Amino acid sequence: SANSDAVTYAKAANTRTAAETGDRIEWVKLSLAFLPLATPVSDAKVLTGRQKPLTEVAIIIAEIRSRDGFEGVGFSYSKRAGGQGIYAHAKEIADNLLGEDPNDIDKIYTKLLWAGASVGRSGMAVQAISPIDIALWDMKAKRAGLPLAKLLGAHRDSVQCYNTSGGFLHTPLDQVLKNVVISRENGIGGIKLKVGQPNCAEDIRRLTAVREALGDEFPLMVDANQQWDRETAIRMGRKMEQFNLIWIEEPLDAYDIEGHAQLAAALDTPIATGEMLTSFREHEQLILGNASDFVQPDAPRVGGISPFLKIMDLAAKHGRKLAPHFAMEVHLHLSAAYPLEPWLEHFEWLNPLFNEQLELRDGRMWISDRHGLGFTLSEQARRWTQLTCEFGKRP
Amino acid sequence: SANSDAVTYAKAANTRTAAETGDRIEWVKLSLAFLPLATPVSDAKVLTGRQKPLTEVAIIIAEIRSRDGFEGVGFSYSKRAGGQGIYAHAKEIADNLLGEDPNDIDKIYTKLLWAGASVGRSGMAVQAISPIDIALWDMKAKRAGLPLAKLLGAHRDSVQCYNTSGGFLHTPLDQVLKNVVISRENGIGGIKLKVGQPNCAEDIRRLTAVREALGDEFPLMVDANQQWDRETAIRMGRKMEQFNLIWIEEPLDAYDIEGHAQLAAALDTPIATGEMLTSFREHEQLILGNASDFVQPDAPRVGGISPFLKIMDLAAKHGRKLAPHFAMEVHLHLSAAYPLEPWLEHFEWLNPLFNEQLELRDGRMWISDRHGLGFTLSEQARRWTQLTCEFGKRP
Ligand SMILES: O=C(O)[C@H](O)[C@@H](O)[C@@H](O)C(=O)NO
Ligand SMILES: O=C(O)[C@H](O)[C@@H](O)[C@@H](O)C(=O)NO
Ligand SMILES: [Mg+2]
Ligand SMILES: [Mg+2]
């Protein structure tokens, strides 16, 4: 009988609990490696004097192994100063992972934030948690025998991909046009050109040439890397309407919410921003402020996959498109899980860190059948490792 | 080298894709069963004449089997009219599942909504998707070899649990006091008393008696099931402050947002509501309107686990507590995944449907080590099945 005049209670023949049987983390290895860039890279931030050319990329890696035989790998990074701090903090909190059930990712995240409460819930501290958070997701996906995108649930099996590495400002227009061809012949689905240099006319010149070379249809976008003031932004915006760009990225300071909102409302061309934000909170302020048509989160930068998922849902709720920044090795899976058609950003910079390469074809990057992130650390990654530490004992 | 003066592209040694290797749904079985209630149940909705006593519960079950050998089970229900419609719609859209990768839960959900676009994105139609959505989550958890709570990521391994079945209005005060003892001796962590009958004084009498019997500390809550108007709600609210209730539930019409908000702001006692809502959208309107301190979603009612997860995140963002309604067999896992300390509602009604029983001890319900939802359909569930249909072919 379902019920009676009183109340009755069913008893559990098997009281074996999830707590007593769950897996446990027993080993963790952190690494700080540096990805050398033979060709110094300069976007508008360098041409305006805000920064020096980029010559390397810091990569902070986390490897986690569980008692029951599972392993996860993940990473965060830093372009310019930040890598030493991310690694150092990760090192100071990593031992908190030992003995935890690796499936309780959020519970662990919270424990790590408390262990470092003094240093906040945004910025560097969460970027130190990113490698760990990502490794745990990588592990859970593997535990299920699924590529990460499938563990999250995918809406597509491949995502539109555009290249950024071939459109930097240290590159002469001549070489940029050559890059467009190389990229296009390799199946790229779009081209992003860096703009925002002091000489506005020169950017217009380079942009018109690229559109000319690509033809009217090919997806083309520009990126100012925060280098314009409001006056210049709207001026350049008006003048670029003719190129039918997929979007204008970071026209203003990453924190100029009303400035972005204003440009977005004034132009038909989509506005994109967010790569520099370092937390859900920060992205939330921009989204509530209607700053852009395209939201561009960066899992490593915002604290990992866990917060990135929350940002995705917020963006979707506000009807925005998603175009994650950098780290395609991770973002491929996240954007594959986004409800609206997204874009993936391509750089070849991290290719040497892994043994496996992603398939770029017919303008899209395809999700392989490999589990989790679908990557294994290369020997080169070990060679480029400068600092490393371990906790626990390999199972 | 990470980069060069031009741009280069890595090639994929293994282009095997996630699309070509993914699992596939090959069989689906739907059932409409009826859970008989020997003792007709009456809450305030019956005493005010809005409805007739509850004598049974409709249970709509979905069973899904994949090519690679995985299976998932899930269900939704209806108290009073609704079961026939939920089953009928589920039956009319179920064949859309055949050939789909069961891991793309959201992609599938969207396909099902489109197949039934004419009937909306809330209400009965999504309640027909609930059994399916839940079965797919059950399957994914099993695929990972984890209880559902662990697949989602848990914050606790057990959750505070209170009983509701022993505090209904068709039950004489004498028997209610006996029920309190039975429940307390069986390890219940709290008691909920139904109120909201025309005779306000009688409810106060019953409530004072229960508090008296329980002692000052024991968690006690009340539920009006929408039966008070605003005037009476605040009046009863003021008078119940003395009982230090964990919450006052559904004091007003489920859609009286400002009414609830007003009561919540006027009383220190928490206000709880939401069980009757049938979608994320509906819950969103109440949360944005600050209707209650406790958000009470119902996975079956809102369209399944997928939408329920979105509701959880919204609630958390607004700093609200979670107290899911009914279906503890499913809600145990969801509330275990909630960041703030939640409450689980107990009814023994569904116990006969499954072979396994949940462990209630020391005021909390413990998550077993069983995978997915951790339940298998009983022979009794088959005996109570009135209609059934199948699609595809058992693997
Ligand atoms: O040179 C840099 O600072 C980076 O490569 C930067 O331009 C890049 O992260 C970016 O903004 N791409 O969208
Ligand atoms: O009798 C009913 O309508 C139900 O049992 C209802 O009271 C129950 O779903 C509820 O509101 N419990 O919290
Ligand atoms: Mg950029
Ligand atoms: Mg209720």
- Assign residue A192 the CATH number of its domain: 3.20.20.120
For residues B42 and B53, is the Cβ–Cβ distance under 8 A? yes
**Do residues B81 and B160 share a domain?**
no
Relative to the CA of B194, which ligand 2 atom is closest?
7
Does residue B7 sit within a domain? no
Does residue B2 sit within a domain? no
Does residue B281 sit within a domain? yes
- Give the dihedral sign, CA A330/A336/A342/A348: positive
Please give the Cα distance from B13 to B3 (Å, whole number): 20
- Asked if B151 reaches chain A (Cβ–Cβ under 8 Å), the answer is yes
Number of domains within chain A: 2
**Do residues B203 and B278 share a domain?**
yes
Matching residue, tokens 């003048």: A239
Neighbours of B120 (CB within 10 A): 13
Please give the Cα distance from B123 to B276 (Å, whole number): 10
Q: What are phi and psi of B239, to 5 degrees?
A: -65, -20
- Give the dihedral sign, CA A123/A107/B344/B281: positive
H-type alpha helices, chain B: 18-21, 44-47, 83-93, 105-115, 124-143, 148-152, 173-185, 200-214, 230-240, 257-266, 280-288, 299-302, 305-317, 328-336, 379-383
For residues A353 and A380, is the Cβ–Cβ distance under 8 A? yes
**Do residues A254 and A369 share a domain?**
yes
* Best mutation target, B3, B113, B121, to test chain A (most A CBs within 10 A): B3
Does residue B9 sit within a domain? no
* Best mutation target, B7, B158, B318, B368, to test chain A (most A CBs within 10 A): B7
**Do residues A391 and A242 share a domain?**
no
Instruction: Determine the residue type at A349.
Output: W
CA within 13 Å, CB half, B228: 25
Please give the Cα distance from B239 to B331 (Å, whole number): 32
Please give the Cα distance from A354 to B155 (Å, whole number): 33
Does residue A5 sit within a domain? no
**Do residues A153 and A279 share a domain?**
yes
Structure tokens, B347: 């009814």
Q: Has B150 been annotated as catalytic?
A: no
For A6, the closest of B6, B154, B175 (CB atoms) is B175
- Assign residue A121 the CATH number of its domain: 3.30.390.10
Q: What is the largest CA-CA distance in chain B?
A: 86
Way it was determined: X-ray
3-state SS of A311-340 is HHHHHHHCCCEECCCCCHHHHHHHHHCCCC
Please give the Cα distance from A294 to A273 (Å, whole number): 7
**Do residues A356 and A255 share a domain?**
yes
Please give the Cα distance from B65 to B72 (Å, whole number): 7
**Do residues B165 and B310 share a domain?**
yes
- Per-residue burial over B255-271, b if 16 or more Cβ lie within 10 Å, else e, is ebbebbbbbbeebebbb
**Do residues A312 and A204 share a domain?**
yes
Overall residue count recorded for chain B in this entry: 395
Does residue B328 sit within a domain? yes
Q: How far is the CA of B239 from the centre of ligand 2 (A)?
A: 24
Q: How far is the CA of A371 from the centre of ligand 1 (A)?
A: 29
Residue of B140, B325, B331, B333 with catalytic role: B325
- Asked if A357 reaches chain B (Cβ–Cβ under 8 Å), the answer is yes
Residue B367 with chain A: CB contacts under 8 Å = 17-19
Beta bridge pairs of residue B28:
B64, B391
**Do residues A25 and A64 share a domain?**
yes
Residue nearest to atom 7 of ligand 2 (CA): B43
- Asked if A366 reaches chain B (Cβ–Cβ under 8 Å), the answer is yes
Structure tokens, A117: 């409460």
Region of A323 please: left (phi>0), alpha (psi -120 to 50) or beta: beta
Of chain B, the end-to-end C-alpha distance in Å amounts to 49
Tell whether B345 is in a known binding site: yes
Q: What are phi and psi of B110, to 5 degrees?
A: -60, -40
Strand A294-295 relative to strand A271-273: parallel, antiparallel, unpaired? Answer: parallel
Please give the Cα distance from B98 to B132 (Å, whole number): 12
Range of the domain at B48: 16-145+379-395
**Do residues A365 and A324 share a domain?**
yes
Residue A291, C-beta contacts closer than 8 angstroms, at least 6 positions apart? A257, A260, A261, A264, A271, A273, A274
For residues A222 and A192, is the Cβ–Cβ distance under 8 A? yes
Residue B310, C-beta contacts closer than 8 angstroms, at least 6 positions apart? A313, B280
Does residue B10 sit within a domain? no
For residues B173 and B206, is the Cβ–Cβ distance under 8 A? yes
Residue B91, C-beta contacts closer than 8 angstroms, at least 6 positions apart? B30, B389
Instruction: Determine the residue type at A242.
Output: Q
Specify the resolution in Å: 2.2
**Do residues B341 and B390 share a domain?**
no
Please give the Cα distance from A183 to A162 (Å, whole number): 9
For residues B56 and B35, is the Cβ–Cβ distance under 8 A? yes
Please give the Cα distance from B94 to B335 (Å, whole number): 28
For residues B240 and B207, is the Cβ–Cβ distance under 8 A? yes
- Asked if A178 reaches chain B (Cβ–Cβ under 8 Å), the answer is yes
**Do residues B136 and B179 share a domain?**
no
- Per-residue burial over B369-388, b if 16 or more Cβ lie within 10 Å, else e, is bbbbbbbebeebbeebeeee
Does residue A7 sit within a domain? no
Q: Has B89 been annotated as catalytic?
A: no
Closest approach of A291 to chain B, Cα-based (Å): 20
Q: What are phi and psi of B54, to 5 degrees?
A: -85, 125
DSSP string, A75-135: EEEESSTTHHHHHHHHHHHGGGGTT--TT-HHHHHHHHHHHTGGG-SSTHHHHHHHHHHHH
